[PDB]
Amino acid sequence: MIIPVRCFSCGKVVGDKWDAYLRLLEEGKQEGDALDELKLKRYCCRRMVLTHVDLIEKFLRYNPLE
């Protein structure tokens, strides 16, 4: 839905690196290189950031009820 605040396994704060990750992917950098530039060493954080689905962008398409 939205990027989780912390890594599920270890607990590193990864919720502040989503915009940076997307911007790094904008310049055509590979996903592994982008993850490396964010200092995500353990693969728990790597799967936390890499496999996330930003579903909230769909939820914001619907017109608000108020």
């Binding site: 912390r6 599920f8 396994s9």
Partner: protein, 144 residues
């Protein structure tokens, strides 16, 4: 429809034998596999004759009889609970009264919450059915 979890295949303490697993409690505390549960209840008025119809209203203690042991203070003046209200099991969420066919002569057709379920009133819908009678749908949200 799932999540990528770090799995270790090991005989740690014998608590995962015969098709069972040990879950990291801290991972649960961080949001792993947490989910929302939505359940919707429905209620509509029905017509018995020329004007013999039910109504969504808050039942009274004196003029209305057959009161369930569940609480009624959570209902509003129109018998519909406002969204964003914590309730527990057996609580009345829809209050409907039916006149007795020929004071203290009103059947209570109130719909209570499931006794084994809790949650918050996520949404309330009021509308009219095909024939024009009242129609209410209450969606409850809880966290598993």
């Amino acid at each position: 429809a799932g999540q990528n979890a770090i799995v270790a295949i090991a005989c740690y303490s014998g608590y995962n034998q015969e098709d069972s697993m040990i879950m990291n409690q801290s991972s649960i505390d961080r949001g792993l596999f947490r989910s929302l549960f939505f359940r919707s209840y429905m209620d509509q008025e029905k017509r018995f004759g020329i004007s013999i119809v039910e109504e969504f209203e808050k039942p009274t203690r004196a003029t209305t009889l057959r009161l369930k042991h569940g609480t009624y203070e959570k209902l509003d003046e129109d018998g519909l609970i406002a969204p964003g209200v914590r309730v527990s099991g057996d609580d009345i969420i829809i209050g409907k009264t039916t006149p007795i066919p020929p004071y203290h002569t009103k059947r209570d057709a109130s719909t209570p919450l499931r006794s084994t379920e809790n949650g918050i009133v996520d949404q309330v819908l009021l509308t009219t059915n095909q024939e024009g009678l009242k129609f209410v749908k209450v969606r409850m949200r809880t966290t598993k």
